[PDB]
């Protein structure tokens, strides 16, 4: 269903990444010279911060300047809505591509395909140019994008482009600030491949943990200090997985990069991305 009040679609996990990339590039938009992907929590609980607002505005400006693609949750919650709003604001002052991958199963309204349009769980933001919904089933709405998104990023990483130097490749930077658990899994899978994720030691909890770290007791104390209620609600079994993912992330530091809180410069975002690449 294509909706204009942009393009939308329903996806299956078995769909090949190469076919999706061919569709995207050939049909609609230009080749990507950069793939800044923001990972955060889908929960609506996103306490807006002043420095975070400035940082994300700078990130959007950089993405527009370089022509980068932006991949987000695209569910109109917390940081998602603001990261789309900055794109709108820049679009009203030569275009920004803000693909958003969400889950069909978790979506509330169903508008089957010509250009069916509806206005208004997990309603989806319409402020993103392109939306990709993937759910082979399971109306219970378990996360499904956590695989297709990573596969697409990896395939585009291997995609060779003879531009922007970088050895005929694409930057594919991985911005991470949210304190979600799925953010931890996303960071782990991103670092599994040679994707230079970058974190900021700001409001993010799972992000501040990694920023401070860069043993089991160390991880436990850090996550208790930064996520006391979350760890209290978390079961014992999940703690083993959390510690394992944290150890995997801290294993490699050449890919992971951090942003200091002291740095108040205007171009700290660009400095972090450039140093990571």
């Amino acid at each position: 269903g294509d909706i204009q009040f942009g393009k939308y679609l329903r996806l299956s996990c078995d769909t090949d990444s190469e076919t999706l990339y061919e569709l995207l590039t050939q049909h609609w938009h230009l080749k990507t010279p950069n793939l800044v992907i923001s990972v955060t929590g889908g929960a609506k609980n996103f306490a807006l911060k002043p420095r975070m607002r400035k940082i994300f505005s700078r990130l959007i400006y950089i993405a527009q300047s370089k022509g980068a693609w932006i991949l987000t949750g695209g569910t109109h919650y917390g940081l998602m809505k603001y990261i789309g709003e900055v794109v709108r604001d820049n679009t009203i002052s030569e275009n920004i591509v803000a693909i958003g991958i969400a889950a069909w199963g978790m979506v509330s309204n169903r508008d089957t395909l010509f250009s069916a349009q509806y206005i208004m769980l997990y309603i989806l933001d319409n402020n993103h140019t392109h939306l990709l919904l993937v759910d082979n089933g399971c109306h219970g709405h378990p996360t499904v994008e956590a695989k297709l998104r990573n596969q697409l990023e990896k395939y585009i990483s291997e995609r060779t482009s003879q531009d922007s130097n970088y050895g005929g490749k694409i930057p594919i930077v991985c911005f991470a600030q949210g304190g979600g658990r799925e953010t931890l899994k996303a960071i782990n899978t991103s670092v599994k491949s040679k994707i230079p994720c970058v974190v900021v030691e700001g409001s993010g909890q799972i992000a501040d943990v990694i920023a401070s770290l860069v043993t089991s007791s160390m991880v436990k104390e850090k996550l208790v200090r930064f996520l006391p209620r979350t760890v209290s609600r978390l079961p014992e079994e999940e703690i083993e997985s959390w510690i394992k993912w944290l150890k995997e992330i801290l294993e490699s530091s050449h890919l992971l990069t951090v942003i200091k809180m002291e740095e108040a410069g205007d171009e700290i975002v660009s400095n972090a991305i450039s140093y990571a690449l």
Partner: peptide
């Protein structure tokens, strides 16, 4: 045009 390709692809 494109929509027809989407039919089979997706």
């Amino acid at each position: 045009d494109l929509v027809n390709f989407i039919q089979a692809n997706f």
